[PDB]
């Protein structure tokens, strides 16, 4: 006899973060083999086509008319925003830094070049 008793395990390749879900920077929204979902707004894409969040926000799945026949995952900076954002409106940006109210810290920062 000779049996075909050999197989790899399942690659855990679902969506790891869902519509309306809060995200943090670095977090993986999708694991996939090839771009089933394309990286949308405020979202990066890795070597393994893994969509990850570039900013803190709300994960949103959407279609964009500019790219028909392509699904997108992006991260809205608030829950208020429809994440296929209006084209000619200005981009919702995050400053994401804090001023150094502390005097010593500010001085150190000024010194550093």
């Amino acid at each position: 006899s000779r049996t075909s008793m050999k197989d790899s395990a399942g690659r855990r390749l679902g969506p790891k973060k869902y519509e309306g879900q809060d995200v943090s920077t670095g977090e993986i929204i999708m694991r996939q083999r090839g771009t089933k979902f394309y990286p949308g707004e405020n979202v990066g894409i890795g070597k393994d086509h893994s969509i990850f969040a570039l900013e803190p926000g709300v994960v949103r799945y959407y279609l964009d008319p500019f790219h028909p026949k392509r699904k997108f995952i992006g991260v809205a900076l608030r829950r208020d925003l429809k994440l296929p954002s209006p084209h000619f409106e200005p981009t919702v940006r995050r400053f994401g830094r804090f001023e150094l109210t502390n005097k010593r810290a500010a001085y150190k920062e000024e010194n550093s070049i």
Binding site: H87, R93, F95, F98
Partner: protein
Amino acid sequence: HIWSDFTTRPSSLSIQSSKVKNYLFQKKASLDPPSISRRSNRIKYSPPEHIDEIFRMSYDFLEQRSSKFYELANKTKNPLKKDALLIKAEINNPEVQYNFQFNNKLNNVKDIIDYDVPVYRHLGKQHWESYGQMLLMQRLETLAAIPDTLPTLVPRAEVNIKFPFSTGVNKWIEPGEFLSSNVTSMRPIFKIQEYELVNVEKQLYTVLIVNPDVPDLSNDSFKTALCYGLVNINLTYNDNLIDPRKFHSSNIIADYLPPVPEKNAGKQRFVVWVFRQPLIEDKQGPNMLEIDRKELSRDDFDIRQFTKKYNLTAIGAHIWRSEWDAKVAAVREKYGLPPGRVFSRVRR
């Protein structure tokens, strides 16, 4: 022979250099080109054979065509059509081609390239479309100065800026340049070169330099800042350099505040926009407009809202972008602005 006549036609259509003109129009290939300044090089040079007679024939052909066009041009009443006819007549003139190609378009001398003349203006427009306009568009799109400030641009006027008063050096700013705080310490100089047919006497303009990237920590985002605001400026095709000479203190809706980027706040886009005024009929002379100076604010400035209010149309744009350096504190001190904030290096 319409192109030899200068009774009704401007002086600019001729070549001002006499030697060059003589070289162009001779009966044999005897003379040597004025372009080649050096004797040895002239000796070395040999122009292609038979070029003269054929050239003369071509001139005659195109001169005839121009004359025919002129027959139509004078009968025409409406202005844009007339201008187009004039362009058609003179665009193939060798002399005007020589003038345009081989002399400066930016700081045009009126006798050589007159932008009051329609043909020369058309040529200048074409030149702008070929390179400078495309570049400007690229810099607006890539840096994200269009959607962030003002939705779109349909580039009509070529806008070039300069910073003569601060340092001393002469340099037209390439769009999307990084300028030092020393360079942009004092105000800039605009040159709004208009290529469309427009009423020079009536048409006024406004110029707004806006900084979309100043950080607002309440919103955790950015806000706009009107760094320099002029209104009701008069341009002329040749007389178009917007300098403290031209505009009065009444024209300044918001007088120049310099780029003073904060440490680690990032790179700050400064995108000048040039709008033309709405032109009112049944009113001789330039129609002014009053700006509510308490209503518009400098620390936060809705450009789009402002445009909507005064019914402006953005014809031109230019952009530089400043970031923090050692001298920004000195600039602030000179202007009497406060010490200036310092942010964390990490965008956490």
